Ligand binder design. Structure first.
Ligand SMILES: Cn1cnc2c1c(=O)n(CCCn1c(=O)c3c(ncn3C)n(C)c1=O)c(=O)n2C
Length: 563
């Protein structure tokens, strides 16, 4: 069951009352196609350090009397035997007909990370928080917890700027404290599973940004997750001038933002390689967007792509723009659900779709207004399915379920109103993903690292280092716990994820051997580097770019098992 493909979708609790979000509610979820639903969002309470609802009314109070609850054709009523209403009642009611769809509570997000920073400060607060997550999933009938901390990184000025007053003083410890948080959550959730006779999950949606990842020194937390979802989107957008893809799959040497870097990093496949240092592919999900970002008055490029713009797209090209002063004026971002872009194309024959065969995503270009918007369509879904099969990925995580498309019951020919176009939300791309995940079958089990099958040696190999972008300076400490000197000329090897490039060994000699998602690095010492019994020797060198961890460490062709 753990090797089954996963199709996980985010449910936005705010959508049901919002025109731009299509008034999407729980009965509009793609229940026949999703395997898991992530409810967005819970957060951490500032005073109690417990999990808390963000919109309590939506989650547990709303009766939907002013909204339409129906699935397929059948009216859906709230279950009156439950002690809560809201989206959570509808979720439980639907799950009775879809008992194998797993429900996860997502905690955090871009605007819900703030109180994580203080909660992680002490072990007793982490314990209180983890206990409260167990209480919450029991109370509201959830199957697990998804942690969306943006971001547990030492990178200065990462995460939401509104939280710098909390994150900046904590940068040096955030990664260590996050690792304790995830481990403690796993411990408490596994105990609850045993007590309740139910298999609860713990997952995380994690950064794909090399800038953020340069400040992440320990990815051990990943081993405690049922799956790790890479947020392989938001690679590009109106925060800078580079008119480039939101969510490319493959590395693109023409991405102008990274054209001088060691390799192109702003694509799913780079993050896949990064995370292979700590996880097998079958525990990694691809992030897929059902939203866009974009620019207007684009200069240069070809059909906008690889051009430049200091003006993110606005107006009818930005219906999901943020309203930060709550005045109706939206911040330009070129942000739309997919169905709205389809409706714009129905109205404008000069808003045209193009395909990038390198990145394997589509984009939309208006050649008169010079508007470029990212896009996602059947062709990119098919390319993503091919990637999932080729890489043995666990599946996909979708932000966000009201952005898929289908035909609109409220269509009015000739109307420009947001919810009167040919299309509204639907299940077209999600069903296509589900069908493809069914067709390819279950994941394979990735074999264990080969080192554990080798003969053991009582040598400890400890890999550490420091990252100063783009350079990782490593230090390997080798301790001889045998009773005989180890002569110089010994070798150590390790597998380095292909998110990074080995550059130099500072002493001795080295070789680099292709090994799948890794390069095997073999460091051969000089004859003078003898290791006395109970002694430690250190070697250093440099690697370009970052990686989640190293694997498959060997020493003199044996498995170094320490003391
Ligand atoms: C964890 N995660 C994974 N992918 C994500 C996120 C995430 O937090 N956000 C940022 C989400 C911002 N947001 C909103 O847009 C939002 C909202 N309430 C009303 N809206 C309109 N909340 C509570 C919120 O947090 C994303 O945009 N994506 C792609």
């Amino acid at each position: 069951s753990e090797l089954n493909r996963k199709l996980v979708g985010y449910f936005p609790e705010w959508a049901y009352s919002s025109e731009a979000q299509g008034y999407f509610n729980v009965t509009d979820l793609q229940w026949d196609s999703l395997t898991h639903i992530q409810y967005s969002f819970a957060m951490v309470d500032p005073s109690t350090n417990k999990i808390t609802l963000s919109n309590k009314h939506a989650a547990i109070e709303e009766d939907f009397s002013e909204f339409d609850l129906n699935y397929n054709g059948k009216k859906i009523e709230l279950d009156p035997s439950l002690p809560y209403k809201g989206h959570f009642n509808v979720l439980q009611t639907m799950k009775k007909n879809y008992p194998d769809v797993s429900l996860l509570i997502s905690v955090g997000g871009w605007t819900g990370t703030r109180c994580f920073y203080t909660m992680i400060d002490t072990d007793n607060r982490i314990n209180t928080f983890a206990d409260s997550c167990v209480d919450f999933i029991r109370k509201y009938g959830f199957d697990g917890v998804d942690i969306d901390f943006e971001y547990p990184s030492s990178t200065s000025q990462s995460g939401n700027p509104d939280d710098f007053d909390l994150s900046e003083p904590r940068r040096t410890k955030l990664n260590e404290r996050y690792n304790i948080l995830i481990k403690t959550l796993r411990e408490k959730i596994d105990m609850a599973s045993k007590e309740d006779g139910k298999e609860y999950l713990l997952t995380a949606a994690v950064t794909a940004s090399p800038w953020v990842l340069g400040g992440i020194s320990d990815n051990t937390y990943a081993k405690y997750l049922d799956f790790l979802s890479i947020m392989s989107y938001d690679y590009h957008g109106g925060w800078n001038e580079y008119v480039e893809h939101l969510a490319g799959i493959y590395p693109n040497k023409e991405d102008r933002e990274t054209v001088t870097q060691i390799m192109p990093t702003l694509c799913m496949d780079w993050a896949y390689r990064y995370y292979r240092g700590v996880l097998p592919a079958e525990k990694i999900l691809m992030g897929i967007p059902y939203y866009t970002r974009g620019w207007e008055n684009v200069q240069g490029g070809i059909n906008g792509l690889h051009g430049s713009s200091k003006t993110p797209a606005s107006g009818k090209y930005n219906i999901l723009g943020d309203d930060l002063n709550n005045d109706g004026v939206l911040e330009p971002a070129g942000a739309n659900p997919l169905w709205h872009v389809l409706n714009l194309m129905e109205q404008d024959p000069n808003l045209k779709v193009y395909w990038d065969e390198i990145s394997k995503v589509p984009y939309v270009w208006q050649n008169d207004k010079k508007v470029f918007v990212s896009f996602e369509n059947e062709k990119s879904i098919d390319a993503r399915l091919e990637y999932i099969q080729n890489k043995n990925l666990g599946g996909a995580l979708i932000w966000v379920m009201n952005g898929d498309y289908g035909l609109n019951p409220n269509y009015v020919e000739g109307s420009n109103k947001i919810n009167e176009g040919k299309y509204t939300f639907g299940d077209t791309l999600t069903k296509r993903l589900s069908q493809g995940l069914k067709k390819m079958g279950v994941c394979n089990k990735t074999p264990d690292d080969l080192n554990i099958s080798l003969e053991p040696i009582n040598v400890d190999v400890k890999f550490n280092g420091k990252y100063d972008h783009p350079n990782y300076t490593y230090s390997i400490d080798i301790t001889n716990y045998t009773d005989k000197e180890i002569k110089g000329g010994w070798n150590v090897s390790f597998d380095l994820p292909k998110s990074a490039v080995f550059k130099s060994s500072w002493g001795g000699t080295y070789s680099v051997t292709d090994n799948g998602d890794f390069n095997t690095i073999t460091l051969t010492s000089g004859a003078w580097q003898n290791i006395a019994p109970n002694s430690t020797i250190t070697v250093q060198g440099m690697i370009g770019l970052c990686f989640s961890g190293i694997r498959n460490v060997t020493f003199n062709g044996m498995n170094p098992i320490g003391n």
